[PDB]
Amino acid sequence: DPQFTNVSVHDPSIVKDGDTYYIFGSHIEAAKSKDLMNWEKFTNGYTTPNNKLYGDLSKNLAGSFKWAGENDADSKGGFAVWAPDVFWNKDYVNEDGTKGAYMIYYSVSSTYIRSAIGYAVSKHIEGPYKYVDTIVYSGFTKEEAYDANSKINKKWTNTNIPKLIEQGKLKGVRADWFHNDGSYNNRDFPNAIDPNLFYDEKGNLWMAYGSWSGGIFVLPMDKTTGKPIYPGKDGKTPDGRLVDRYFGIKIAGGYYQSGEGTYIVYDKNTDYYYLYVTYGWLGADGGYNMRQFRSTSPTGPYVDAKGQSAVLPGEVDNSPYGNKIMGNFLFERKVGDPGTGIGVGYVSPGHNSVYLDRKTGQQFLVFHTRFPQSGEYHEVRVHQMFMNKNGWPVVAPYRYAGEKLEKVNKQDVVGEYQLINHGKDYSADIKKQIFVRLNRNNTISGDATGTWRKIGHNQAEITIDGETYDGVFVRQWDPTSKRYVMAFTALSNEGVSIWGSKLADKTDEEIVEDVASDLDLGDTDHVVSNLHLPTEGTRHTVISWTTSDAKVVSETGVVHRPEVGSAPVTATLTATITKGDATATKVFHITVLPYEEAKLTAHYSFDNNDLSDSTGNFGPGTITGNRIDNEGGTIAYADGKIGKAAVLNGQSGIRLPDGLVSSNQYSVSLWVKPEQLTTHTTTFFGAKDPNHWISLVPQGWDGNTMLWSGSSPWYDGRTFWKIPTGQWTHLAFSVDNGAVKVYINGVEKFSGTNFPDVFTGANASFALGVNWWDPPFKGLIDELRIYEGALTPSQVTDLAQT
């Protein structure tokens, strides 16, 4: 019913310009909306010149790129313009003397510590923006020094620090900024990225910034020029926090611990400054999670609901600190729950901004998030926030769909809820719901016990297992059942957040009936893998299974595929579905298909002195340079094992089509002739992205040939066999839902199980000879064969001989 239009803007910074909401994010992406639900992108990313925001990107921001962010270190091959903040400065004096401009403060970065913050200005919010200055630097060193893949001198004299000492704004370099070896002290001093510009109660302007390293700092800003008013002298705050002559006042983080994307909001209605920051790492494996603090002053001390400091006492785990207002979660659609799909959940939600409406007092949390089973794909989400009785804004459980706080009747509150508790810990783990009832007698029962009260129109007080959470009841759009449902969100003085979502009233017999209808094992006529047989349905409905022929498929859905040539073997599985005293039954006819020879899906023979695929299923391959992503190198062609083969000079590689392997049953075969061995150098390499990869390695860390996988988990399939240079070796491996075999010249050399499932659901990047870390292969590659299914040992031998 409400309708959404989504965009991919990383690190969104929200700002209202008249009737339009805009968001500016990393990689020069921005978008606009009139309602916060339908977004439309108006930028063109890093495209240059005629860059939507910056015009001629390289020349406009050259002053910043001189220090980092342009084809240098981790930005080699392109640009790194990160996490901007945009706002209207009515006092800014333009270069023609007029007053008022939109300022975009951006960041540029080359390494985890060599970065800078600069800013550009414009008369209109869509740009283009013209460079003004580069104002904060990090990652500089005491004496001349350079980073890998970098020609830029990191000595502190190449920053604005000399100019400041000259003007008398600083007395001179701080000794504490460098380690004994002259390296940048990022244990105490910050990484200069992720800026946030905010006004305090008096209309003074401030800039908070930081990301990991020494943590988050805040500087007063000159409203006329937009330049920091550097403290000029070191010190401590009354309460003991670091003050630095240059970087400013420390308000959160420290000691290398996570924490970026600072956003600070002054709320005149409670007289607090609210500090938001994101812990963990942005990737789907990183446990990105939003944290909330508050202060009576713009420069701290910021504390959480437990009254603990945002600034860490030392190199410790930062999980206890900050109200964790959102992490990984899933309102799982269990069997029999209305709707389709796995339910609504987020993975690594974070780097937020906040829109606070000076008029209606309405508040919105704006951020990007990944999604369960979607990989690194991200979208923007907007959740409304509501001020609780303790002066803490609490986050709505569902994305904003137009709702507002209303008078709520007890009749509309009472009933069964799904309940998610965000806790304090964070990781790749995903929090799922439990089931509780808010009863008419103001008790809570079910998967937890306690009480609830509705106070006034809609404030909530929920007490579970000892803990009192305070928030609001509010009606929200559930995308799964596709109804507006009663919901609640509340926060304890432990800084812990609970979310509740009300379920439809249903008798036990209605539930069991719903479960029976929704229960489905998928296509049971062509079963080639074990079946997952659910033993639970929604609201703790129990499901129990039996077989009519366990020789075919067990009670647990373990299947026994017959001998190649046999007929398909069939059998019946029966489900018994109970809840209370209701019961139902469903039966499933399973047909298990026999084993089969693996099917050739691609064949790169190089027989025509090209990078083409012989079966014609897949496109040609393309030439690479030193790694899988870049280009430049060359592929020559010599006489091979079968015909012509491909030559790798040691500075090139071969990129193969995306989704070459797109399942969990597959095999690869190829001939190699190595001219030289180097450890961790790949031949066949495939990765869903630089974090989930498989590599066939001629010489591995044990000094032997092996199949290897990373980066989570790590599988070491080793053969204890050393590959000879100057000679032809045939290599093949097979993967089969967990088990894996590796073959050297037709001989099995490794059998293991529990091999990763790198390629299902994704559509991975594949290469020959090059990855992201290691020296390319040097020698000859021939007859790359790709299969669906596991190669029989018989097929292995044939390839190894003819």
Which of 368, 579 has the CB closer to Ca ion?
368
Instruction: Give the C-alpha separation, 719 to 391, whole Å.
Output: 62
Does 457 appear as a known binding residue?
Answer: no
> Considering the complex, what minimum distance in angstroms separates the CB of residue 83 from Ca ion?
5
* Cα–Cα distance for residue pair 703/618, rounded to 1 Å: 34
Task: Report the nearest approach of Ca ion to the CB of residue 374 (Å).
Answer: 23
- SS percent in the chain: helix, strand, coil, step 5: 5, 45, 50
What x/- string results for residues 656 through 695 when contact with Ca ion is judged by CB under 5 A?
Answer: ----------------------------------------
Does 642 carry a binding-site annotation? yes
The distance of closest approach from Cβ of residue 195 to Ca ion in the complex, given in angstroms and rounded to an integer, is 7
If 0-12 CB within 10 Å is exposed, 13-18 middle and 19+ buried, where does residue 12 land? Answer: buried
Catalytic option among 85, 260, 416, 470: 260
The answer to whether 605 is annotated as binding is yes
User: Exactly one of 11, 29, 478, 736 is catalytic; which is it?
Assistant: 11
Segment holding 508, helix H or strand E: helix 508-518
Contact flags string 497-536 toward Ca ion, x per CB under 5 A = ----------------------------------------
The DSSP code sequence of 165-178 is HHHTSSSS--GGGB
The response to whether 607 counts as a known ligand-binding position is yes
Q: 412: part of which helix (H) or strand (E)?
A: helix 410-413
Q: What is the DSSP string of 237-301?
A: -TTS-EEETTTEEEEEB-TT---EEEEEEEETTTTEEEEEEEESBSSTTSB-EEEEEEESSTT--
Residues 6+ apart with CB under 8 A from 296: 271, 272, 273
With binding defined as CB under 5 A, does residue 613 bind Ca ion? no
Stretch touching Ca ion by CB under 5 A, among 9-17, 181-189, 614-622, 688-696: 9-17
With H, G, I as helix, E, B as strand and everything else as coil, classify residue 791: coil
470 binds Ca ion (CB under 5 A): no
Q: Of 246-285, which residues contact Ca ion (CB under 5 A)?
A: 261
Nearer to Ca ion, 10 or 432 (CB): 10
Q: Does 605 bind Ca ion (CB under 5 A)?
A: yes
Closest distance between Ca ion and the C-beta of residue 775, in Å?
A: 24
Report whether the peptide linkage leading into residue 128 is cis, meaning its omega lies within 30 degrees of zero: yes
DSSP, residue by residue, 434-478: EEEEE-TTSEEEESS-EEEEEETTTEEEEEETTEEEEEEEEEEEE
Q: Judged by CB under 5 A, which stretch of 13-21, 323-331, 594-602, 716-724 contacts Ca ion?
A: 13-21
**CA atoms of 374 and 390, how far apart (whole Å):** 37
**According to the binding rule CB under 5 A, does residue 610 interact with Ca ion?**
no
Task: Rule CB under 5 A: say whether 640 interacts with Ca ion.
Answer: yes
DSSP structure class, residue 230: -
Work out how close the CB of 12 gets to Ca ion at its nearest, in angstroms, rounded to a whole number. 8
The CA distance from 369 to 162, in Å, is 41
**Candidate residues 508, 607, 629, 757; the one interacting with Ca ion per rule CB under 5 A:** 607
Segment lying near Ca ion (by CB under 5 A), choices 6-14, 147-155, 301-309, 490-498: 6-14
Is 143 known to be catalytic? no
DSSP string, 713-754: S-EEEEEEEPPPTTS-EEEEEEEESS-EEEEETTEEEEEES-
**Nearest distance in Å: CB 615, Ca ion:** 14
# of chain residues touching Ca ion (CB under 5 A): 10
Show the tokens assigned to 574: 């029966």
Strands 431-432 and 329-332: parallel
* Identified binder of Ca ion from the candidate list 78, 372, 568, 643, rule CB under 5 A: 643
99 near 89, Cβ under 8 Å?
no
Amino acid letter, residue 583: T
Active site residue 11: yes
Q: How far is the CB of 196 from Ca ion (least distance, A)?
A: 5
Binding of residue 128 to Ca ion (CB under 5 A): no
Does 782 bind Ca ion (CB under 5 A)? Our answer is yes
Q: From the list 158, 642, 657, 675, which residue makes contact with Ca ion (rule: CB under 5 A)?
A: 642
| Residue nearest Ca ion (C-beta atom) | 643
- Let me know: does 114 contact 138? Beta carbons within 8 Å: yes
Q: Indicate whether 719 belongs to the interface with Ca ion (CB under 5 A).
A: no
Q: State the residues that interact with Ca ion by CB under 5 A.
A: 13, 83, 261, 605-607, 640, 642-643, 782
Residues annotated as catalytic (active site), given as ranges: 11, 260
Binding site for Ca(2+): residue ranges?
351, 605, 607, 642, 644, 782-783
